[PDB]
Curated annotation (Swiss-Prot), chains A, B:
Changing residue 280 to V: Reduces first-order rate constant over 25000-fold. Its EC number is 2.6.1.1. One of its GO terms (cellular component) is cytoplasm. The lineage of its organism: Bacteria, Pseudomonadati, Pseudomonadota, Gammaproteobacteria, Enterobacterales. The modification N6-(pyridoxal phosphate)lysine is found at residue 246. It comes from Escherichia coli (strain K12). This is Aspartate aminotransferase. Belongs to the class-I pyridoxal-phosphate-dependent aminotransferase family. Has been used to construct a 2,4,6-trinitrotoluene (TNT) biosensor strain. Changing residue 374 to A: Reduces first-order rate constant about 10000-fold.
Length: 396, 396
């Protein structure tokens, strides 16, 4: 039964880990998978996280199964983060949250939920998006169509082209929005633009699906949720697939959430039963450790304040790396205007590098980026900035 | 559109948790979800696991993503547990292992892998079986049929009806076997019956899928794997979905493995690339904490020795509860002979209580079993045994 299975090439993003690890050159530089590095070039466990893990070690007395939807406190805390303390959606009990294995697991749960329980047939995704969006939705049995988003020559959001392409989206179609730190472009709608899309989404009867993996990495926790909240103020129905992988530096513990919003409590509760069914037929119930860490931190004032400073510290280091990157490219001999990189939000720079250029970077210089030209700015340090900029200039 | 979603019924197993919790009857007893309890009715963390978690807290320097297939040492240890050290399968590099979120996640990845990459259309499961088997395979669009298994009159394997009922299973159909501790009957094939099934499977061209959620709970680690190893000696291809939930008491950390075996290394590696694609489109990569604990224990001679004894301790307590259960039903005036319970393997008793009797146990006595009459013997205790048995005597 296995003899004729077709070979696959590895993931465009995740395939880099193996390639990177096998490389024997001491000067290799990993600018691939979106993980935060500190000034030492390491990916540390947060101080708040270690303290929470120490608490769990001494205080946990069981590994008994969580409910299919995970830790109740974790749900409450994520709804507050998403919608704002004292939001109508929380007061009116219009939202239900399943803790999931990462933002990824939350996307798949949402896709399975919609495919198996509604008339949804297709999902609209921005032209450049995270490459795994198509795979997740296709695997669930959904068609994916693209909408215009990025102007590659101007390195800007082409809002008019976005609106125009989305006129092909019908009522009952899903449209995927990145909550902030659009991946890979780093370009987000302004508040006014979010408000426009919210209005249009209502008019046209789309179902908004928010992928919210970087809350805290654009401007801040509350500010980064303004887009989602503008949608939430306007819609009866939406779904949010959120992640704590990046904002808690908890990548390998797989901590995310799928939040279902409906017109009222009766409707959301009934629908969430089917979401629970889709989880049950997948991984049964979610992993406790990472989510417990998150709930422990978010529900303790002192710990939360420590974590919030740590997240601010990550955001600010990336911003400093972004400026240093642009300044160093100039010193190393790049002719061209890279000022657009300063305007990008989040971990990445969508650099404009060619497939052949990124291949050269890997092969000749041991600098690893995604073939789309996506580079992880969060993986840049004062120590590796010179060599990576020399490498980029050498392939220009 | 969420108003169009149809009402679900709660899971027949996992649904018990909320119902049991909500019950206000003093002296209520939970015999539902299969978790081990000690003599005082707690579900403790193993001391081996606490020591492992201490080690991790001290030594972990990052939460950086695992690969799609998880921790390499975890995969190695898993294959040794499954097939035995120096197994031909391991030496010929015919097996590949992905760490997954539980045995549940392992079943799901097998299903997704099979549906997308093979001509498998049909999976045969036992009547009765764990109710989530059908759900997981159906999620991938695979037809699930039932084969005869249990002779409930005699409380044995109806082996003739088993053979007859699988007459119709075609070349390229999957047939699912429980490695040991059949859920819910507690009746396993003898080794001769395993060898008979292994031979028939080869003749008929089935693809065996072993669900191995209870290794160690029937007789011991190596003996419990005899059936699997009999199949493995005979087959070019098979899949194993295994779980460390019960044998490490690590339920909520979601610790499992999907192991793929093919005729040779070229084939398994090529097939496994597609298995990774199936994981990527689901939850991307597995949760580190539980699997690291398992790997830490199994790879350290001293820690592993501690764990092995803790496992045989659990097994011993369950066996004492089987005997106490039969004796106490006797003492409390049951006329139905429950001696058959003594010969059942694993955590459960398939008691032969009807759906009406189970409901009355719940409503009248606050005693919670699964509607199939499956009772968790591992949740029985010297203190709860007498009231539990008085309640059963009252409803028969």
């Amino acid at each position: 039964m296995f003899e004729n299975i077709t070979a696959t090439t590895a993931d465009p993003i995740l395939g880099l880990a193996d390639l990177f690890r096998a490389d024997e050159r001491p000067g290799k530089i990993d600018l691939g998978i979106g993980v935060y590095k500190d000034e030492t070039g390491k990916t540390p466990v947060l101080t708040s996280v270690k303290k929470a893990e120490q608490y769990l070690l001494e205080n946990e007395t069981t590994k008994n199964y969580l409910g299919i939807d995970g830790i109740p406190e974790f749900g409450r805390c994520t709804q507050e983060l998403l919608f704002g303390k004292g939001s109508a959606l929380i007061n009116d009990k219009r939202a239900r949250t399943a803790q999931t294995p990462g933002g990824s697991g939350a996307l798949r749960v949402a896709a399975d939920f919609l495919a198996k329980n509604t008339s949804v047939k297709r999902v609209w995704v921005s032209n450049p998006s995270w490459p795994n969006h198509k795979s997740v939705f296709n695997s669930a049995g959904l068609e994916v169509r693209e909408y215009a988003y990025y102007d590659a020559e101007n390195h800007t959001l082409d809002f008019d082209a976005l609106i125009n392409s989305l006129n092909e989206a019908q009522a009952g179609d899903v449209v995927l929005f990145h909550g902030c730190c659009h991946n890979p472009t780093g370009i987000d709608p302004t508040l006014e633009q979010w408000q426009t899309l919210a209005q249009l989404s209502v008019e046209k009867g789309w179902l908004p699906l928010f992928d919210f993996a970087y809350q805290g990495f654009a401007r801040g926790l509350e500010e980064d949720a303004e887009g989602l909240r503008a949608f939430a103020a306007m819609h009866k129905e939406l779904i949010v697939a959120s992640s704590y992988s990046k904002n808690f530096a908890l990548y390998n513990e797989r901590v995310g959430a799928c939040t279902l919003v409906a017109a009222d409590s009766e409707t959301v509760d009934r629908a969430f039963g089917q979401m629970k069914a889709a989880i049950r037929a997948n991984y049964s119930s979610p992993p406790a450790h990472g989510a417990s860490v998150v709930a422990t931190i978010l529900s303790n004032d002192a710990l939360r304040a420590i974590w919030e400073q740590e997240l601010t510290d990550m955001r600010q280091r990336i911003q400093r790396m972004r400026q240093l990157f642009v300044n160093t490219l100039q010193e190393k001999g790049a002719n061209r205007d890279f000022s657009f990189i300063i305007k990008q939000n989040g971990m990445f720079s969508f650099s404009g590098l060619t497939k052949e250029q990124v291949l050269r970077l890997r092969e000749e210089f041991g600098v690893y980026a995604v073939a789309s030209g996506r580079v992880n700015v969060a993986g840049m340090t004062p120590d590796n900035m010179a060599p990576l900029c020399e490498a980029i200039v050498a392939v220009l």
